Write a protein that binds this ligand. Structure first.
Ligand code: HEM
Ligand code: HEM
Ligand code: HEM
Ligand code: HEM
Lengths: 141, 146, 141, 146
């Protein structure tokens, strides 16, 4: 579970991302499509090239859920229940892929937040996301 | 991958009793049941509601047969596997959009179908050999994803 | 969450295992040291020889914990002279090996219980041991 | 694993500005902090509870340098990785008994330290070349495990 200090480091780090959140979104994705080619098997309908507006718009939506998530850190299973049903039932996206996004997302934060991304914050951030990933796979079976 | 001669013959000999039509079908159907999300490819098949109609669907059986068959070819190419399924790794990728975890998934339920088929004969040394096959085979089939 | 049709499946499966529990635990273990050679990195102080009285003595404990889990299907940990939070802190076993033990402990049951190993009781057994690994890896960080 | 003429250049060129001593103890330290179960191979270093203590632990630092040191010398021979690491693979398995999944966790932490270090200079195409490489080194240290 996230310790109280974890919950503080996550909100402290996200607060600093700010208006750039949806910006970092598309970047975590591009890094994912490019680093782990396998991840783009779920996007036959998306122009995945760089510059792409679809890869940008989506990143904004990925940013929004982690913001709603940070907002409801003590109640993620209820605030992300909607998406969990969307990924497992309607998308059926294999659980080993979220571990893949969370890594690119984390690298993307190590690239823009060098002051804040200390070893302590890094760890709390690897937790927060693992907990998100978990919630998103709750409804697979 | 290289296989210890007797560990290579445990594969060779046991395969010859495998009813590829019963094990092929059960390998796929038991996969569509256990890891639910794997149906994102099998929607054309039809009725996959309860684990019942999943197992009894003549499409699931039908496709598990040609899935096991191709496996039953790399069993000869037990040296260079890549230069065999590399063709199917293009397909399953570019055209078919299949996530490689599902192959890794197949190999494990298959290991279980065989043990459900040979009970006692499926000793640990034999399972272990059959693991060296399935993992390596899974990676050959997912070698050049771009 | 294990559905109610799951609990009753898991229960009948293990009750059928009866006294054979320890017999089975030890078998899944040896299957694991053979199929997945990396798992041996955690038992370099165990007599890993065929027929070993240290693995059989270990398969017993593991089964005794799996029987206790089943017999308190609303709560998964705590058992023997040191579990409770034993793995997370003392052993520190990488979470990745828990899925390997569960696989091998399922092929064991698919081998000896071919009649109760319907492709529905297999899904419950799978969801069960996944819920146990999830509980044992619960307080890791 | 495979790489390409242009990817090698990005790897090699981004490795020149790397301070192996620094990043070595920066990566192993952040590994021991994000995945504290890896501390099972380090009772013989000292205080490893608080992150302050892990990072500035002179013994962590001394060993980070050794690892990344021997990591660095592996980039040179990027066409024969499994060979180059055959003797460290056998030493980690037999002698040290180091679960190979530690190498993958360390590779992921090493990529974050390299993004944390180069900022924008560590673009998406640099991460993808670096992921391939760190996955490459991990399969190479794990090859001699039995
Ligand atoms: C780490 C957790 C993730 C977050 C925060 C996230 C969030 C979301 C959100 C907010 C949507 C928008 C749904 C809508 O309104 O249409 C969505 C859609 C989707 N997600 Fe996830 N997701 C996550 C991980 C994944 C991963 C790893 C993949 C697969 C590589 C993925 C694949 C999809 C797909 C394919 C869509 C549908 C896009 C479309 O066709 O319009 N998600 N996700
Ligand atoms: C590792 C064993 C496998 C082998 C050797 C194999 C073999 C085949 C072959 C030969 C084709 C059919 C002919 C064609 O489309 O041109 C095919 C297609 C396909 N495979 Fe596989 N496959 C395997 C595993 C997978 C996995 C793990 C999945 C399951 C999620 C899967 C899902 C599909 C799908 C949906 C198609 C497209 C429909 C079609 O068959 O035409 N395959 N496979
Ligand atoms: C998910 C299934 C697991 C269960 C139910 C389980 C159960 C047990 C039990 C009951 C004990 C003995 C407690 C004591 O003696 O105080 C124990 C100890 C231990 N477990 Fe686990 N375990 C599991 C997974 C793991 C995994 C996956 C590994 C690594 C491959 C592992 C490695 C160990 C080791 C080394 C010991 C200590 C034995 C000794 O040296 O005394 N366990 N486990
Ligand atoms: C991918 C990079 C890795 C390389 C190239 C590597 C390299 C080395 C080297 C050269 C040594 C010296 C062995 C000797 O004295 O002959 C060593 C020792 C050791 N390694 Fe690894 N290693 C790597 C990853 C790891 C990881 C991931 C851990 C665990 C977090 C680790 C744990 C050990 C241990 C326990 C020792 C001895 C520690 C000491 O006495 O200072 N290594 N490693």
């Amino acid at each position: 579970v996230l310790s109280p200090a974890d919950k503080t480091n996550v909100k402290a780090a996200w607060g600093k991302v700010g208006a750039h959140a949806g910006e970092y979104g598309a970047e975590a994705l591009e890094r994912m499509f490019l680093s782990f080619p396998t991840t783009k098997t779920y996007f036959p309908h998306f122009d995945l090239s760089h510059g792409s507006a679809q890869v940008k718009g989506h990143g904004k939506k990925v940013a929004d859920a982690l913001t709603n998530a940070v907002a409801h850190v003590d109640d993620m299973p209820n605030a992300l229940s909607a998406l969990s049903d969307l990924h497992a039932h309607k998308l059926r996206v294999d659980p080993v892929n979220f571990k893949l996004l969370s890594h690119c997302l984390l690298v993307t934060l190590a690239a823009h937040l060098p002051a804040e991304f200390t070893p302590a914050v890094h760890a709390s951030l690897d937790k927060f996301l693992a907990s998100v990933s978990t919630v998103l796979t709750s409804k697979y079976r | 991958v290289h296989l210890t001669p007797e560990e290579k013959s445990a594969v060779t000999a046991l395969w010859g009793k495998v009813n590829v039509d019963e094990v092929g079908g059960e390998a796929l159907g038991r996969l569509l049941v256990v890891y639910p999300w794997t149906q994102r490819f099998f929607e054309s098949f039809g009725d996959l509601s309860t684990p019942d109609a999943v197992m009894g669907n003549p499409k699931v059986k039908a496709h598990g047969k040609k899935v096991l068959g191709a496996f039953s070819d790399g069993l000869a190419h037990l040296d260079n596997l890549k230069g065999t399924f590399a063709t199917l790794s293009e397909l399953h990728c570019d055209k078919l959009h299949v996530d490689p975890e599902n192959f890794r998934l197949l190999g494990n339920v298959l290991v279980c179908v065989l043990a459900h088929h040979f009970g006692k004969e499926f000793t640990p040394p034999v399972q272990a050999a059959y693991q060296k096959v399935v993992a390596g085979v899974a990676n050959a089939l997912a070698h050049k994803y771009h």
